[PDB]
Point group: C5
Chain length 206, copies 5
């Protein structure tokens, strides 16, 4: 229950041990969701890394946002991957919002307030309710099995999550810095646990 406003978690060096665990008070299993966050790293040009890792006992990669070197954004839900190609990679903080809906399988990926085309993925599936949500490390087992070749080195912040799909207008205000209320993960009332070489400093992005 910490107001993480104007703050960001910063992982200064490549580790096997650093990560931040996010505690979500989930009761009902997810039939849709929207997760937005701000990250800033320099790895994009050399290796892949994990941005957001939502794992279940049954499925280690229930919902995962990853940057795969030389390709682009790799959005995977329920163990099934999908790609959002990004040819020219630029170094600057980046803000992403991604959403999925069981009813149609339509997944949207918004990078810096601008939408990528809509794709289909895991229609009819249903995301597990009890999960280990980790920032900065790649989960390969419920809350563990971290491969350092997929660790995040840089800053990450403003992570929020809704249990429904945000509309283009809402996704826009989130980007522009408008007022909103998440209902799963809330950066203004975040309940987390730090582990390793990770510090809390003022955010670099405005």
């Amino acid at each position: 229950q910490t107001d993480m406003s104007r703050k960001a978690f910063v992982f200064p060096k490549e580790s096997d041990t650093s990560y931040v665990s996010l505690k979500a008070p989930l009761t009902k299993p997810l039939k849709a969701f929207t997760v937005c966050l701000h990250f800033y790293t320099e790895l994009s040009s050399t290796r892949g890394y994990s941005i957001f890792s939502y794992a279940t006992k049954r499925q280690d990669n229930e919902i995962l946002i990853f940057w795969s070197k030389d390709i682009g954004y790799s959005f995977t839900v329920g163990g099934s991957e999908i790609l959002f190609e990004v040819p020219e990679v630029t170094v600057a903080p980046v803000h992403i919002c991604t959403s999925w809906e069981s009813a149609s399988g339509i997944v949207e990926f918004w990078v810096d307030g601008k939408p990528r085309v809509r794709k289909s993925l895991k229609k009819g599936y249903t995301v597990g309710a009890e999960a280990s949500i980790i920032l900065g490390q790649e989960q390969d087992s419920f809350g563990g099995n971290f491969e350092g070749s997929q660790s995040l080195v840089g800053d990450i912040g403003n992570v929020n999550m809704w249990d429904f799909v945000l509309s283009p207008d809402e996704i826009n205000t989130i980007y522009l810095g408008g007022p909103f209320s998440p209902n799963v993960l809330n950066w203004r009332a975040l309940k987390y646990e730090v582990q390793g070489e990770v510090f809390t400093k003022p955010q670099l992005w405005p």
Copy 2:
């Protein structure tokens, strides 16, 4: 009779079966026309696809707007094709308005509010009045014979059609979001029929 305002039809995956049929209450055969629409796809770089297919019992390709891979926009009326070359293809929603006039054969193609040069095509011809207008699939027979290699994968919306040629100023307000009244196909009073894997979601373009 549905107000499709702020909405778009979205074809999430490559199909042989998905399409949307538009019902136009046409009585008089067309001697000119203007059709404008907004589409957003990622196919441009790999294959060709059908944007707008107006077919008659006698002529399957009465009026057809198509993107032919590596070339550009392919505007065909009355079975006769014409090309609007587009070298550097970019991924972003795009808005096009195209018009034809029997009296001179002059066809204009406006991409994103800016006009391409005027070309001549099918002078003296006259477009059939009873037609099957389909979105997302390529007609090769009245209301059927769909080739999946020409299906549209992405969003399409704001389709409107006039039975006369819009002026540069009108075409401009349509683009900029001004008020106007179509007299053949009206996105604000659309009468359609969905078939297959196609959903109605909020438009991504502003």
Copy 3:
């Protein structure tokens, strides 16, 4: 005596027969002149074409503005040519004003309101008073001998001509859409004769 305001002549297809003859009530032979016009074509990238052709019985190319493929603007007065190189060709309507002065031979070429350097050409010469001025075709004989490989395909409009040299400030208002009064060719009181496949439509440039 037609007010061609807000209009443009449009040559939709490659011809050997289409052109527009402009009638100028000239009495005194020219010792200087300024001719401005707006044109919009897509040929620039493939072939050369004639923009403005002023011919005399004695000299078929008394004053001629031409685009020679891969080089740039070719301004020729009195059979003698001069070049205004344009490396990167862009497709959009373009406005040009060009002027010549017998007294010094200084010829200016203004493209889109911005001046190219001053060059010398045909000093002391004197342009013939009785001439055939044609739009869209390349004259090789008084009022004839059209080579289709030099025809114009696109729109052309706002042609005006003065018997003196416009100053930078005047050339500027002409560009910006200010008020002025030509004294040879006047687009507001144009006296022309159409021949072939050429139509009069609303101008695409603002």
Copy 4:
């Protein structure tokens, strides 16, 4: 005690002897610091050079900002180096602010008001209080041992230093020209000593 406002030190030619010594009234050893400055040189494309050299009797390179040819900014504190790669080098005045914190080892490097990612360097270390701070030359011994291959040729000015870490907002006003009060080195109340071919002229950057 000179108001160096609107002024810059200028080293016109490559020397072995030119430099400016800055006198800081330091009592407590540094546990953190922020140093900002403006420099403008043309060497970037041919050789490396010293921007800011803070030396102690025990450690000649206590805190040093250097540009290493073909690589980028080389920030070293306590003899330990770290790199901020800059691929495309541009010639224009540049403003940099850099900071370090013993408590975490986090070092920030801001170039022209925009932040580079955060890196870790010399955690737990503590910078010496009695030091020789030199501008324009590379120290390899307390107050001496200058290698001319690392001399600065150009202008340098607006150097300020704080004993704490400036926040993003503060670093921003410093850049934008807001009001602030340094507490180690103050360009408004600078106490220096010039040596060699160095002059004081009006700054070229705004």
Copy 5:
């Protein structure tokens, strides 16, 4: 004693004979100076042109500004040269102001209101007072070159000269069109002599 305001000298063709001599009523020898001017030419072959040539009986190249496409700016004072090369080649009129100070040898070169780095050249030297100042051609007094000098082809104007070094703020107003008073060469009270194929026409730059 002519108000050359809003005018420019124009050399239409490559000559061996065309030039403009400027008469300066100098009494005291120069210990510093600032010379600004506007020129506009068509950066052609390796053959560059002389922009400003200030010659003495003793030294033919007392102060000379020379520009060649594939070289950049060559500023020479007292027979000794120095180079300022400008990267992006903009095809448009250009305005330069350059200054030198005997006391330090610092020479500044400002192109289009923006400063290039400060360099050292001819410290302690002193420019001759009785000189032949020529526009449009290099000046090598007592004859002796094997072949001609070959003149600038284009327009040149707004030449002014001060016997002291202009500050950044002054150099800025001169560029932006503010009011000032030269004290050696004054474009508002210019005393010149034309020779050859050179005309006085309205300036193309604003």
